Design a protein around this nucleic acid. Structure first.
Length: 279
RNA sequence: CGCCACUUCAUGGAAAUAAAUCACUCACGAAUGUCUU
């Protein structure tokens, strides 16, 4: 009945359009945070996607998300949606197809956000993540780092930024932290993550428009890689317990897939919303 | 005039060389520029 953390875990490519005026080759760019330039989803897009999924359940939509745009009478929604910040991203590797890349700065920002928002299971996650971050800083000692926690993953190569994965044996990764951040997790410096998540390294796809075999238009598209993880905060205010429980159970159902992003018909931005499990 | 055979069985040179290494076209088009209480 308070602020809750949700994880997105996109199962496909995701393209949430900024609508910004492009200065380069990529016509369609993805939404990025103003301050940190990390990929993000606007709260309006999150609310739109979740309302689209639940649109059939009219009472739940009216109670939680509010009235329709054409409704003759307006009811404010009881649920407040926040921005979805990038948690982890898949990066190309050599021993494995990919690794889930996280940075120290995004971990610190997540800790600050949970402290500021006071999530449901905030305390244990804050304590364990703070201990992990302090151990990481103790082992790094001001140097650029890339730490794997699976012993088999030692010596892994991040392809885009040519760095090698080290294994600190005295830094334990708790199972809940693995469930939150992902499997085959790599913790590296935020400079490496910023380079990996910048415009020159995010996947760019060429697209065509053909009329009777003649190309009408050409443009390039930017997408967020599949299996990337994003987190947002949901504030319910104080909604009906039955509608809120229905919303949480439907969201956490393994068979529930939410479409966030532009290209729905060609399978862009299908995700599985998770809840912060108790530690 | 008679009688009678042995010997030798591939070396040297050339073992790739130039020309073209992407060209032209499309590089966003249409809708929405606020709407409902």
């Amino acid at each position: 009945m308070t602020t809750r953390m949700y994880v997105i875990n996109t199962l496909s490519n995701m393209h949430v359009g900024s609508g910004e005026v492009n200065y380069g080759v990529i016509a369609n760019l993805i939404q990025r945070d103003s301050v940190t330039n990390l990929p993000n989803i606007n709260s309006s897009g999150l609310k739109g996607a979740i309302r689209e999924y639940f649109k059939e359940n009219e009472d739940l939509v009216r109670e939680l998300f509010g009235s329709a745009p054409r409704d003759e009478k307006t009811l404010p929604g009881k649920v407040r949606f926040f921005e979805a910040n990038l948690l982890s991203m898949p990066v190309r590797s050599d021993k494995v197809p990919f690794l889930m890349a996280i940075s120290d700065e995004v971990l610190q920002e997540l800790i600050t956000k949970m402290k500021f928002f006071n999530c449901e299971e905030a305390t244990q996650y804050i304590s364990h993540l703070s201990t992990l971050l302090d151990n990481i800083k103790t082992q790094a000692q001001g140097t650029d780092f890339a730490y794997v926690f699976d012993p088999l993953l030692q010596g892994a190569i991040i392809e885009e930024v040519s760095i090698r994965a080290t294994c600190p044996s005295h830094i334990p990764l708790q199972p809940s932290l693995k469930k939150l951040l992902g499997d085959r997790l790599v913790i590296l410096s935020h400079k490496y993550f910023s380079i990996l998540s910048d415009d020159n390294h995010l996947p760019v796809l060429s697209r065509n428009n053909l009329e009777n075999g003649q190309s009408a238009n050409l443009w390039y598209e930017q997408v967020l890689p599949r299996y990337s993880r994003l987190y947002f905060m949901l504030m319910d205010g104080n909604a009906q317990s039955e509608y809120l429980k229905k919303f949480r159970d439907t969201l956490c159902t393994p068979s529930t897939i939410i479409q966030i992003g532009a290209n729905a018909s060609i399978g862009y931005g299908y995700c599985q919303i998770s809840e912060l499990s108790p530690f």
